[PDB]
Amino acid sequence: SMTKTSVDCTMYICGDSTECSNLLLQYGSFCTQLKRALTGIAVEQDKNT
Amino acid sequence: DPLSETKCTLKSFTVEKGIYQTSNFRVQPTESIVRFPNITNLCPFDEV
């Protein structure tokens, strides 16, 4: 297994900035894909062990 | 309530047994503090 990581878009791409929240929402569901992929990887690591 | 957030993030009115990541907890700064060097070497205005 590897390190069981997870990422928050709304904090990574911008931090205290709230304008980036609105600017990112219009980008679409890339971050839902990212969170689903990373959660799948994490559950996969648990299953591996 | 958290269960309704789970329902919305799963887009299903029935959620199966498990753990689902719904939102992101975040703590925002309560106060704002500004600090600068304490020593103030008073220029000789009083002297003149």
Per-position DSSP letters for B31-44, written without gaps between them: -------------T
Backbone angles phi, psi at A4, to 5 degrees: -100, 85
As a 3-state breakdown, chain A gives helix, strand, coil percent values, each rounded to 5, of 60, 0, 40
CB distance B26–A39 less than 8 Å?
no
Residue A24 contacts B, CB cutoff 8 Å: no
On whether the CB atoms of residues A18 and A45 are closer than 8 A, the answer is: no
> Residue B47: CB partners within 8 Å, gap ≥ 6?
none
CB distance A11–B24 less than 8 Å?
yes
Structure method? cryo-EM
Question: What is the resolution in angstroms?
Answer: 3.1
